[PDB]
Design an enzyme around this catalytic site. Structure first.
Site, short mmCIF file in Angstrom:
data_model
loop_
_atom_site.label_atom_id
_atom_site.label_comp_id
_atom_site.label_asym_id
_atom_site.label_seq_id
_atom_site.Cartn_x
_atom_site.Cartn_y
_atom_site.Cartn_z
CG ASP A 39 -0.38 51.32 35.32
OD1 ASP A 39 -0.54 50.05 35.69
OD2 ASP A 39 -1.15 51.97 34.66
CG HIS A 69 -4.26 51.08 33.95
ND1 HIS A 69 -3.11 50.58 34.12
CD2 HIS A 69 -5.09 49.71 33.56
CE1 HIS A 69 -2.98 49.02 34.10
NE2 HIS A 69 -4.24 48.73 33.77
CG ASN A 161 -6.21 41.22 31.11
OD1 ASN A 161 -6.35 40.77 32.21
ND2 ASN A 161 -5.92 42.47 31.02
CB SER A 224 -4.46 45.62 35.01
OG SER A 224 -3.50 45.84 34.09
#
Length: 279
Positions: A39, A69, A161, A224
């Site tokens: 990530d 994130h 998403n 996520s």
């Protein structure tokens, strides 16, 4: 063990019903397992990680999580308050820059990195990788995820998403990894969650509280956020000896809460990740 006033998603993972606020789990808590969080990095000095997080690779000028994130996702895997597996070892791989973007060639390199790097780490109970990222279909990206899985790592990836069929996104569309959609606190499919036959499992994804950069916390939403619930659950179950990296996705599906979610399209699994912990 019982954590009172837990984030709803943790409570949901150990419950047959929505609407409760205590997380129940075996105290082994993923000890002896390892989860790679591939990530934007991890703020490993956050007190919530207790020294159990560390950066092992970056493809940029710094290993710092300048976005948040990756820290948030690592927190859902393994932070003391916001995590599923509160004693796992967390490894950060910074394939995403501080704007949250990364080239697929760097993501691929990061996946192959983990497949080799686990041989440099102490993970007697097994190895997991959490990939809260994706983009358009790429056979090369899917192949990289397939190799990582084949190498003996439980690979969990976000479905995406786009409120669409995940067949057109990568690594979501790779069949051999664990593709995770998102649900909300009322057991609805999250409004943004991708769906489709390639999904393996749902996890909590709408309004998930976790760690953030600056030693802080915040709540955000996405597939996520669902993915690290499943990665953490895999690590927890592997520590418990209930499953292995090769079969943990299928075991999670086998033992999931079934038929509890609403607005699941025809042809998508109605399976919500569940630890089946009996206190």
């Amino acid at each position: 063990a019982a954590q009172t006033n837990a984030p709803w998603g943790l409570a949901r993972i150990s419950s047959t019903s929505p609407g409760t606020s205590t997380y129940y789990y075996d105290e082994s808590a993923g000890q002896g397992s390892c989860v790679y969080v591939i990530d934007t990095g991890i703020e490993a000095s956050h007190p919530e990680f207790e020294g159990r997080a560390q950066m092992v690779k970056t493809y940029y000028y710094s290993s710092r999580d300048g976005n948040g994130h990756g820290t948030h996702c690592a927190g859902t895997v393994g932070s003391r308050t916001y995590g599923v597996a509160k004693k796992t070892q967390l490894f950060g791989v910074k394939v995403l820059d501080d704007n949250g973007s990364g080239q697929y060639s760097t993501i691929i390199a990061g996946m192959d990195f983990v497949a080799s790097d686990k041989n440099n780490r102490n993970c007697p109970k097994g190895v997991v990788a959490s990939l809260s990222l994706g983009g358009g279909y790429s056979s090369s990206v899917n192949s990289a995820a397939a190799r990582l899985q084949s190498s003996g790592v439980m690979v969990a990836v976000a479905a995406g998403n786009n409120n669409a069929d995940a067949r057109n996104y990568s690594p979501a569309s790779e069949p051999s990894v664990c593709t995770v959609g998102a649900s909300d606190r009322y057991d609805r499919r999250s409004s943004f969650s991708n769906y489709g036959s390639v999904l393996d499992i749902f996890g909590p994804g709408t309004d998930i509280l976790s760690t953030w950069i600056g030693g802080s916390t915040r709540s955000i939403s996405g597939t996520s956020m669902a993915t690290p619930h499943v990665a953490g659950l895999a690590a927890y179950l592997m520590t418990l000896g209930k499953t292995t990296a090769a079969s943990a996705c299928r075991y999670i599906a086998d033992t999931a809460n079934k038929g509890d979610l609403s607005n699941i399209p025809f042809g998508t699994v109605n399976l919500l990740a569940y630890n089946n912990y009996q206190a």
